C-alpha cells in the first residue's frame, strides 16, 4: 500500500463530496444483496427477506453510517491503517469471524457505489487510488488473522 501525492489529494477531494448519511448505507445494503451469505452476519437487523427489504432495512442503513465513519477514519490516517483499524480487526476476526475475502468485497462494492454516484468524475486514475485505499482497509481489518 502507498498512494502517491496526487492519488491522496484526489481521494480526499472526491470524499468531501460524499453524502455521509447514505453512501455507507447503500454500500452495506448492496453487499447483503449482491453477496447473500453476508446476510448471516446481520440476522439481528430485521427484515432481510428480499433484496428490496435489505435496501430498505433501516438498521442496515444506520450501521452503514458507522461503516462509512470507519472508512473516513482510515482515510484520515492513510499511513497507519493497521493501528487505526486494530480494534476493529479484533472484533471482526476474533469475535465475528468474518472471512477476510468479504472485506475485499465490501471495499469493492463501496467503489461501485462511488462510481455510481459520481459518474464520469470517477476516473480510472481516481478508481485506482480508491482501490489502494479499500485494499489497505481490508488488509488492516484482516490483520488479527495473520
Amino acid at each position: 500500500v502507498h498512494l502517491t501525492p496526487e492519488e491522496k489529494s484526489a481521494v480526499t477531494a472526491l470524499w468531501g463530496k460524499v453524502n455521509v448519511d447514505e453512501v455507507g448505507g447503500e454500500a452495506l445494503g448492496r453487499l447483503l444483496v449482491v453477496y447473500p451469505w453476508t446476510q448471516r452476519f446481520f440476522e439481528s437487523f430485521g427484515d432481510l427477506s428480499t433484496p428490496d427489504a435489505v435496501m430498505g432495512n433501516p438498521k442496515v442503513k444506520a450501521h452503514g453510517k458507522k461503516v462509512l465513519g470507519a472508512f473516513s477514519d482510515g482515510l484520515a490516517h492513510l499511513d497507519n491503517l493497521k493501528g487505526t483499524f486494530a480494534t476493529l480487526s479484533e472484533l471482526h476476526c476474533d469475535k465475528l469471524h468474518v472471512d477476510p475475502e468479504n472485506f475485499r468485497l465490501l471495499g469493492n462494492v463501496l467503489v461501485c457505489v462511488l462510481a455510481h454516484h459520481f459518474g464520469k468524475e470517477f476516473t480510472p486514475p481516481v478508481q485506482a487510488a480508491y482501490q489502494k485505499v479499500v485494499a489497505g482497509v481490508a488488509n488492516a481489518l484482516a490483520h488479527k488473522y495473520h
Binding site: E26, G29, R30, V33, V34, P51, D52, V54, M55, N108, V111, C112, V113, A115, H116, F118, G119, K120, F122, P124, P125, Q127, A128, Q131
Partner: protein, 141 residues
C-alpha cells in the same frame, strides 16, 4: 445459469450500454490496468498507454464477446467455447484476474448507467460476469 429476473436485468443494463459497448470495454481494460498493474503482464506486446489504439481495439473484442454472451445467455459454454481454450489453455490467465476485469466492468457500467445500475441490476450483472468468467476459466477435453 441465470434466473429469469437476472436475464431481464442484464438485457436492460446491456441494452442501455448499446452502441457504446466497445468504448466501455476499452474503459474497463484501462481501469483494470491502472487499478491492478499486474494484469498488464498478460499483454506484454501491447501498448497500454492512455487512449492507445490497441486497447480500444481490445475493448471492442471484449465488448463484442460480452454482447454475444448476452444473446446466448442460456448456452454461453457453447457460444464462448473458443474463448476458454484461449484464456485457460493457451494464456493460462490466473482465475483471480477475471474478478478484477469483472469488477472493472461493473465499475464502468456504474459510472455510465446512473439510473439502471440499481442494487438488483448490479447483483444481476455481477452473476452474469461471474458466469462468463466461469466459462472462460474452464477446461474440458
Amino acid at each position: 445459469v441465470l434466473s429469469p429476473a437476472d436475464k431481464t436485468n442484464v438485457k436492460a443494463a446491456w441494452g442501455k450500454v448499446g452502441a457504446h459497448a466497445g468504448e466501455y470495454g476499452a474503459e474497463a481494460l484501462e481501469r483494470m490496468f491502472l487499478s491492478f498493474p499486474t494484469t498488464k503482464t498478460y499483454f506484454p506486446h501491447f501498448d497500454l498507454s492512455h487512449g492507445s489504439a490497441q486497447v480500444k481495439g481490445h475493448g471492442k473484442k471484449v465488448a463484442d464477446a460480452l454482447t454475444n454472451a448476452v444473446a446466448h445467455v442460456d448456452d454461453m459454454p457453447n457460444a464462448l467455447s473458443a474463448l476458454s481454450d484461449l484464456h485457460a489453455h493457451k494464456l493460462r490467465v490466473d482465475p483471480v484476474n477475471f474478478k478484477l476485469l469483472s469488477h472493472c466492468l461493473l465499475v464502468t457500467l456504474a459510472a455510465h448507467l446512473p439510473a439502471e445500475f440499481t442494487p438488483a441490476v448490479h447483483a444481476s450483472l455481477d452473476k452474469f460476469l461471474a458466469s462468463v468468467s466461469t466459462v472462460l476459466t474452464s477446461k474440458y477435453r
